[PDB]
Amino acid sequence: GINEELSEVLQTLQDEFGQMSFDHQQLAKLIQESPTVELKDKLECELEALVGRMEAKANQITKVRKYQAQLEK
Amino acid sequence: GINEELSEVLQTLQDEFGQMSFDHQQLAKLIQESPTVELKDKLECELEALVGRMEAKANQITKVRKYQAQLEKQ
Structure with a gap:
């Protein structure tokens, strides 16, 4: 429930990072x-x-x- | 259906690129x-x-x- 929700959060964060990274290479x-x-x-x-x-x-x-790590400990 | 699937493809590509970009900074x-x-x-x-x-x-x-842009240009 709490771990289910932290994976959603990470997934979401990494997709934003992937988008920013792509935009970074286009700007460059x-x-x-x-x-x-x-x-x-x-x-x-x-x-x-x-x-x-x-x-x-x-x-x-x-x-x-x-x-996540200091939790599944 | 076809546009739904092209967004999955792009999401997948950009996650790999995001990972490569992060790793690039750690290597550096x-x-x-x-x-x-x-x-x-x-x-x-x-x-x-x-x-x-x-x-x-x-x-x-x-x-x-x-x-995706070609397809939407219709």
């Missing part, structure tokens, strides 16, 4: 093939924000795994 | 923390292979999205 390609420096800078700002959200998300995933 | 930290050059080299070899698999995977995702 866009950046490499950007002509203007104006646009490269706008996209690099957004890439850095996305990376921050990807770090926060990875922590949530790490913490939910510890919840 | 391990590499910074490696003492010996023998082990740094073994890990950099693996990082470069992982990057090749991440490129292949990103194409699969890009293609499945294009097909």
Whole structure:
């Protein structure tokens, strides 16, 4: 019941992480093939924000795994 | 039915890509923390292979999205 629910939570977290990761690689390609420096800078700002959200998300995933581990103990 | 199934496919692809991306960052930290050059080299070899698999995977995702977009453009 509680473990059933933590697996749903992890599944959900990892799908968001997969989406962010995909978007990260598209931004990175866009950046490499950007002509203007104006646009490269706008996209690099957004890439850095996305990376921050990807770090926060990875922590949530790490913490939910510890919840699961220090429980089925 | 066919659109329901293409979303399962994309979800599956993006979970693999998410896993590869997470592993990429762990490898990169391990590499910074490696003492010996023998082990740094073994890990950099693996990082470069992982990057090749991440490129292949990103194409699969890009293609499945294009097909979903084609289908909705009707």
